Structure 1
Amino acid sequence: KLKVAINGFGRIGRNFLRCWHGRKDSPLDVVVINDTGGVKQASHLLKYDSILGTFDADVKTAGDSAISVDGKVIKVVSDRNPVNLPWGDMGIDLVIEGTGVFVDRDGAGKHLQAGAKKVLITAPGKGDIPTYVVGVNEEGYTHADTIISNASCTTNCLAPFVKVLDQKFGIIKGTMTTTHSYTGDQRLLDASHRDLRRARAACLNIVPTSTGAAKAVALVLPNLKGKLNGIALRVPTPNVSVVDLVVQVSKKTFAEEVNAAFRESADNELKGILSVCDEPLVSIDFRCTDVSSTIDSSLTMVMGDDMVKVIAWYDNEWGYSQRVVDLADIVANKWQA
């Protein structure tokens, strides 16, 4: 029912698109979407994915203007300016900006300008957005935020458990790192990009970096700041990535102590959100997997009952979208506007 169009029909565009098909009970009437890229491409792009494979969802469309897929015919155009991107022609309900290039509220404003009602950004918006993230900023979340954001998958995934750890054991200091994959955020080749590292090709090289995680943690976790700071490690992989953090937790504990604690959480709430296990499973074992990350039980060592390594294969793309999808439909509900 939510007449929605997302900006930047990236993988996550397809993801949520697939999630639209994947997730059941989708009031997300996303009958339009934006990406300045070629739409029939995007169609085939939507049609054909690498990781989760081609979206076998056959779509029959008559004319460039109207496109229909799985009954839910869905428009899409290609343009840069959200004002040049008419939204009132549908009176758009929600937008998410997969481009990333609109990393400030103005574009959303500009999206709100052309006739959008609500906005969130999977990416941490530069500056003028208090982000919303499940587990962290979905509780005090208000549907009445016509413009909000998510953070990078990293934060979008690394959040809850350690907060609950912070809830159940506290953390003196946290040193978070990820196996952050590669994306358009980095240059395939050593193409000219602001971050020299993201500029490089690095087909097999990692990027020592720091995503908004150790920053968005501030918003999403009003407590865990500075003390609980690590960086990002943007790796030469395209796919589901892994958390790599060692904490100096506050309360004395040991490995399993958090595990069942981490278990029970997913056993009730991080259900769908996150997971935990110790069966050795590698990336391929996490295709289109939604429980953002199962945490290792063995290698999650604990030293002095505070120094605690943490590790979990996480879906930087689909589970991210999952999480992105999560509150997305939630704001569709409590549909104040």
Structure 2
Amino acid sequence: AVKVGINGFGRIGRNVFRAALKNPDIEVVAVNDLTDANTLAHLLKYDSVHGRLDAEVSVNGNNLVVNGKEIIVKAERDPENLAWGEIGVDIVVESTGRFTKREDAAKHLEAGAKKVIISAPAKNEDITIVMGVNQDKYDPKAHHVISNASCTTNCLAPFAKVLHEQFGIVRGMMTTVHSYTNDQRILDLPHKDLRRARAAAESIIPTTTGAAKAVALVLPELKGKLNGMAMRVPTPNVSVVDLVAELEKEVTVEEVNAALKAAAEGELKGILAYSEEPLVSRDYNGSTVSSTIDALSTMVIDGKMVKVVSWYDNETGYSHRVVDLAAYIASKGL
């Protein structure tokens, strides 16, 4: 397996770690955060959203011990001091949320890693990948700093791919009704985004999203054809994309759902899923797919305007994609 290091052992870092435990291709050997092993161990064992960790965790000296394997714990605020190379770490998952610009993410490379996966939309990255959509575009020689995009983009892109390929998207707009995250605030505090400054668990909070425009990074044909926003709400995990699009081909609900179902069971199995059950957000807590079509919500007007709704566990699905992307990158040679 490829040795992985996780920088920022938080909601995404720990979920990636948990996903990695059940992946034979990658091995997490070290984590970095801003605290001590005791604290990281406690957070890893008991999760308010995902429950008790299905593993034995303990602390040995300054390190974590998980299922008998020692995981080195670092506490370096500056990634340049990480010394990844010294411990054979080849891939670093950059999940602090502070180092989304290449010049920052690349510090892991200076520290000895060979690749960095930024767990968020990035700036100046070598390439942005959405698994199931454009991983074939990854180039092992040219791309060292790779963004895995956002959880919303990972939800929308796979079914946008399907709609576009099968019926052609003329233009479309989305809204994601999205669980709150740690980028928000408990009770009205300063934030660059005056909406995200407001009490997260008390309101429906509109916030801008680059997700629909970011679909263009992975589906160039859709450049300038999409836009949308988010509405953060008082749930702690699980989100849902609501896309309204104008199509080129005339369609029925049955045809749209049938195409989506086909892709889910075929080419996009494990990435896109399809449900005809009348479910609610809690039901998708722990879902590892990127996107699950809520088939009951599909509607069409004039055979040209379609609404497609798709669920995603914003922490889990995206983290499993990070793990898939790391395994994929390792498979192309390091």
TM range (shorter): over 0.9
Residues 293 and 160 of structure 1: CA distance in aligned 2, closer, same or farther (over 3 Å): closer
Matched with 2:52 is: 54
Match of 1:319 among 317, 320, 323: 317
Shift of 1:67: 2.6
Matched with 2:36 is: 38
CA contact (8 A) 2:12 2:315 kept: yes
TM-score by length of 1: 0.94
Q: Give a deviation string over 1:95-118, Cα, whole Å, max 9, x none.
A: 122111111112221111111111
1:72 and 2:73 correspond:
no
- One-letter amino acid of the structure 2 residue matched with residue 15 of structure 1: N
Q: Give a deviation string over 1:269-302, Cα, whole Å, max 9, x none.
A: 2211121122111122122111223212232111
Residues 274 and 110 of structure 1: CA distance in aligned 2, closer, same or farther (over 3 Å): same
User: Relative to total residues, which structure has the larger strand share, 1 or 2?
Assistant: 2
Shift of 1:171: 0.9
1:118 and 2:148 correspond:
no
Please give the alpha-carbon distance, in whole angstroms, between the structure 1 residues aligned to 2:187 and 2:35.
Answer: 20
Please give the alpha-carbon distance, in whole angstroms, between the structure 2 residues aligned to 1:250 and 1:236.
Answer: 37
Shift of 1:86: 2.0
Matched with 1:15 is: 15
- One-letter amino acid of the structure 2 residue matched with residue 89 of structure 1: E
1:90 and 2:90 correspond:
no
Shift of 1:119: 0.7
Please give the alpha-carbon distance, in whole angstroms, between the structure 2 residues aligned to 1:295 and 1:182.
Answer: 21
Displaced runs of 4 or more, over 6 A: none
Matched with 1:276 is: 274
- One-letter amino acid of the structure 1 residue matched with residue 45 of structure 2: K
User: 1:209 is paired with a residue of what secondary structure?
Assistant: strand
Residues 100 and 195 of structure 1: CA distance in aligned 2, closer, same or farther (over 3 Å): same
Q: Which blocks of at least 5 consecutive residues in structure 1 are unaligned? A: none
Matched with 2:230 is: 232
Matched with 2:133 is: 136
Matched with 2:150 is: 152
CA contact (8 A) 2:4 2:93 kept: no
CA contact (8 A) 1:131 1:149 kept: yes
- One-letter amino acid of the structure 2 residue matched with residue 37 of structure 1: T
Shift of 1:69: 0.7
Percent pairwise identity: 59
User: 1:270 is paired with a residue of what secondary structure?
Assistant: coil
Shift of 1:129: 4.2
Equivalenced residue count is 333
- One-letter amino acid of the structure 2 residue matched with residue 186 of structure 1: Q
1:29 and 2:27 correspond:
yes
Please give the alpha-carbon distance, in whole angstroms, between the structure 1 residues aligned to 2:123 and 2:230.
Answer: 17
Shift of 1:7: 1.1
Match of 1:263 among 261, 264, 280: 261
TM-score by length of 2: 0.94
- One-letter amino acid of the structure 1 residue matched with residue 6 of structure 2: I
